[model samples]
Target: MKLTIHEIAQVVGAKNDISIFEDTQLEKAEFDSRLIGTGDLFVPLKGARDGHDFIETAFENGAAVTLSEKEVSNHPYILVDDVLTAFQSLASYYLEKTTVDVFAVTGSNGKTTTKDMLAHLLSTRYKTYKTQGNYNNEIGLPYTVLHMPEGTEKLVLEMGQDHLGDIHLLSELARPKTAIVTLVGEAHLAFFKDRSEIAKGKMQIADGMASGSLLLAPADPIVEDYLPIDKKVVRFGQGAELEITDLVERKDSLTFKANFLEQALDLPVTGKYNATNAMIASYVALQEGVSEEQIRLAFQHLELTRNRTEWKKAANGADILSDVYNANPTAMKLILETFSAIPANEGGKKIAVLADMKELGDQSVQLHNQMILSLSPDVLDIVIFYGEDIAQLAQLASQMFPIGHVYYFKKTEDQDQFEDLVKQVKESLGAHDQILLKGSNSMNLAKLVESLEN
Candidate 1:
């Protein structure tokens, strides 16, 4: 964001002459007109609604310059063929001018969590900034870069993909000094052939990495096919180079050790998947000269994004495990198995509230039904299914468990069915019961969790 109007025009190849005030530096960049401030550059993106309509509002909000497809009279504006591409070019230029080392992470799952962990670890020794919220896509990545602090030493970016070349474009834009792919899974199967294709797309993180830069990925067979030969590949997992030797799973935290660490690392999060994320993050930190003691301290007080497998409590005293942000087949199975293994409270039952796993294309129903294999009547006292595709799984669960133990709620336009679903779950819950909520974000289960919260 240190670029002036003329420099930005030159970087983005703006066709028209930018004769605006010379050396008018842009301190911030914003797409939303409502968020525009003084000395900010307004980038009008063409989305569902035309961003050009908000150009006056952006200028009214103190925007020093605006990027538009059409030339604006009497306004300091940069005309470009496509505002998005021009904005991206500006970010790449800004990154090149800064001395910060870029760290990029992508995968079907755990990318955001890993980014947060890496940022936390690096912040122990350097000034670090990471992707805020789910701003890991093409648009959000540039916004993150332009907003980075002046003297940042580490820039941790989360990369998310829904199509084949999405990550490639992002990698080239960021040109990360180090990259990591957490794991390959069926995240965006609606547009993919299978998991192998997904792995190929995830491997594009190395596309923009330098030849000798480090690329860390899971040791799973799925990722082996797409491994890059140019970059130094480091693997982390069981039987991998950076292997987890020992792990102790507590109700609210996890204690684990990697091969390189001298002592066990304690994380204030649950699940073995989180341990894998932490191990990968620790490897990145260690490579950047972070002390083992700093890593240990960072893990002990780690902060993570919300709505990922977190434990919450209800007003009625029942323990709730809420993971409503997103779900795929692998993540769903892992969390279900992990949650079921936690013993129920005294004289209480174990319940699961699941919704549809979207974006599976033709395999959606089969993947949803496959979740029934993870459910056991002895382990789970009740299972509540929501969404349309979950009917198949609900039928299987009803046949597997006792009568009245399985319920299904088809998504409806009216609120009657949703309210009924909540009421049924409330009536069945006990004071000491443990309930788990997992599904794709479209299921809106987070709202239900909010209602149940004290």
Candidate 2:
């Protein structure tokens, strides 16, 4: 992180004795004691359990200095009233010192995958870093900023939000130079009340960027109002600057042609929306000075990210397209639409396995019911609802479809019921059948896919 104790103390507004520790160079910063390493600066945050409780563990593991409210006996400690606030101050200062061009991405779905894609594309030309795993929250954002290598030239930070005001914290931390928003969907919609608030939250990814910095967003009308202020903005999606010009969905994957970088380039994956995401990644790479040839090669060999509309074939000869990584009304609808469009085989049936989407507040039922438009009684031979909340949606579907077309299986604590349901799906499998296994990850629908395959 290239931070001196004096600089850190100045950022935190702390006065320290010079004799105890003098001009110690901190290599990195961490919050978790378990993650402490040699030459690390530790910031003990107050979580469910006060992180100060683990200060000794951090010291034992190899922490050099601890940002603490109170002085510790043996270790080099930076005294600050709030460790979290002090850490943010250090992160802001570190960002100001670096010449790195930061690209931030936020959306209901594909934030992590898009961040990974942007990072992968940028790495072809620069020393790049990205959000590791799902470390996109308030605390993790600062940790990511301060942990980036000293020579890093490009960075992709993924920002995730649950309620309002979350993305703003990440914005202020990294001061991203370029920002991208995937789409506005029903993720945590029940709490925010609608897509508008979600759009506002996601737009904060550009709040800390320099004036005239690029802001990339979907051309979807719902998020139009959330564009960045006093910034150069580019629109993407169906009718935007970097639009998906054409698409071809195959039995195993999707290949599409896009007018990204003002040139037609073919892209992979089964999602047209994913091609939209790839457009943003290409734009970010170009913004960071990566060459078009490099971007093309990177896009052609783009690493496949898991569970964002992937396909597999079951042992029963049914083609299985699983999108169950994280489920929401918009994602479910998009996937259903994609599955419904597949050219049907003679006497073949389409099936969808759905589960509950958590954190939708009181509008959970309404969210599930919203998918009815995506399901066709003429197309789908069976629709299995696999969670408690979606059972209501299943009952509603029964009325719309025939009595035998929809099946409701409550998400029970017992594994046996789930296994039995897997058996039922196995029994229903037929050659040429197209089965879509989708739900929340907690459903363990992998068991059903495995049963049919095994």
Candidate 3:
């Protein structure tokens, strides 16, 4: 952000004569024209609508200049062969020019939440900035880097990946001093050969860090082979070096103790896995001179990135826990167990509407069925299984649970039973019942959550 127009042109290999913008300094850079301001640089990217079409709008909105692949006549612009590649180079250049220490966070489920937690904790002792919203991918990471606030001491970059090598590119770009992989789950399993490939992809978060840089990884054996040997690696989980010694899960929050902390820590979040996220954030913050009390205070006011794995209410007064954003076998099991362990509402039945988890390739059914181990008839009064892959799992649960306590709805290749499923759910849920809804985003369980909320 400290770069002037001449510096940006040099960094991005600008082809045009940008002498007119020589006196102009860029503050923040954005891809969207609507977000442009007086001293900002507008980067035009190709998408559904070519960003070049918005250049006029960007300038009208107060942009100082725009990076374009083509030459512009009236406005001052930086011309390049490819806008995205040039913008990426500019971001990397900005990182090199500043002393802001980068801390990258990437994992299957808890990346954004952990990023938020780590940034909040670090802010107590440093001028910290984090990835805005879900800007964790290839373009988003660079976009985050270019948009960093002035005088930032800690830059928390949340890196996300769908294909292999995605995280590697982001990591190498940011060159984080410390990186943490919260957990290696099956969130994006379809992109790789198997779960092992997913683990490899997540581990790519550290591919850019120098030797002796810190890496925090889960104790799960799945990630053992992917760990970097040269880096300072620390493990966390059940029996890892940094373990959660004691955990207390309340109705809507969790209080836990870690192996390294002297006093018990508390989190306003619910999932027990979230307790792990909090601990990792605290441990990283403590390493950077944030006091234990500062971490405890920051966690008390934890602000999540979204309403993910959040609890809400049904139209009929039922309590609803919605984990409808992203799902995999690990995330689904953790949420189901957490919801089951929490006592149901007064005089209310416990119901779960579990939909299909996508991207498991051939083992999708088996993975879906594995969730049965997390559901128990004693704890769950009713279980509704939706989506095509989980039909067999529902039949298996129907036999174990009491009659009339199990339901299965289909979301097959050609047809959708979402309407039927919603209608049935509405009829089955009582004013005092507590229900949980979970699925991958494609299945659109969020629509059902919207209905229940309204």
Candidate 4:
């Protein structure tokens, strides 16, 4: 946000004259009035509540100027048709002015982790910044761009999509020099007809990519129909351009080798999926001339976004492996398999608490029941299923296991059933037990984990 008030008005096509100091520079831009600081520009967006109502609060919090749809007497403001569009235009202008190379990531899953890995690897060689939290949406993307520091050399953005043209809007905004699509899965299927359609939506990352820039994708056949032939494309996975060689999945980390690397790579995160994520990230880093040593060291000290797949502990000393956000058939199966493979503590029991995977469209029930095939009586001592769609899976598991070993919440919204499940989980826990919590964010299984923690 190095732009002055006059320049911002010019870029956003503000009809009225900004009466503020012409040379007053906006240090940053914030939509939230509480985050507004000195020299910051306040953007009043209309969401559930009108942001215009908070204009006085923004100015009170030391905002230098504000972007508003209406005129404010005696206050310096930029009057634009839409505050969000104007804010986006300002971010686009700011990005064009900076010399930073942009690396954008989008997929059904692992986008955030890949972005974190890419930023960490690039930061070893240059100043890098990445999208903060779930700020990968249209609003969050521009916020990430406009807030980048003066000396940033690389910008890593995570792009998310719920409907068609979502990625296209973001891709055109950032116009990345390099982009990676981790993998297409059964995510957001309520809005898509099939995986192929989801792949097409994900492939739109190339919409605004620079000509001749690299686009990395998985070797999975689902992505083939949507891939662009004009750009430089690199495929990662078994029997692909950037193939991952020998791989080992440890209890808490993974070790693998890639095609172009002389040394093996180790990631603190587990699973072949994370290995694939690391593979794509390493390719992007290597393409940018980052050394293998830098990438290796970066992995040794990697900081990932929370709630993907994290190990936690309850107050009763039971170990809990929580993956309580963004569940789909692919991700749910992968984490369940990974968690089941890791041996429980000595004399410990393996307990699985699974909630429904959301947004599977007409196939939601089938997808939920399909998870029963992944559960094993030899590995799991108890299985608890939550949500309306999980009843079939619970019935199947109950027949496979004993009567009391399997439980189902036919109505997850029932407060009594939720509390009853929580009590059963707490009472069933032993000091050596290892519990797993995996489901969509809407299931509130994370709250159950929190209850045990408290």
Q: What lDDT score belongs to each candidate, Candidate 1 first?
A: 0.83, 0.75, 0.83, 0.81
What are the root-mean-square deviations of the candidates from the true structure over C-alphas?
Answer: 11.6, 11.6, 12.7, 12.2
Instruction: Highest TM-score: give the candidate number.
Output: 1
Evaluate candidate 3 by giving its C-alpha RMSD to the native, one decimal: 12.7
Clashes of each: 0, 0, 0, 0
Those runs of model 2 whose alpha carbons end farther than 4 Å from true positions after fitting are 15-19, 108-112, 187-190, 260-268, 306-454
Clashes of 3: 0
Question: Cα miss at 128, model 1 (Å)?
Answer: 0.6
Candidate 2 C-alpha lDDT tens digits along 349-400: 7888887777655667776776776788987889988877687688889999
Q: What TM-score goes with each of the models? A: 0.71, 0.67, 0.70, 0.70
Off by over 4 Å in 4: 19-21, 108-112, 308-447, 450-454
Q: Model 3 over residues 1-454: C-alpha lDDT tens digits? A: 7878888888888788777665587778987665788988888886424679779988888988889999887888999999988988988888999968999998535423788889999999899998877678778889888888889999999998767999999998889999999654442233567877777888999899999999999898989899998999999998988999999999978889999999999887788778888899889999999999999888888775664345667778988888754355656886787678777767888899998887766667877887878889999998998899999899899988899999998888788888998899998899988888888876368788888889
Segments in model 3 whose C-alpha atoms lie over 4 Å from true places: 108-112, 308-448, 452-454
lDDT-sorted candidate list, best first: 3, 1, 4, 2
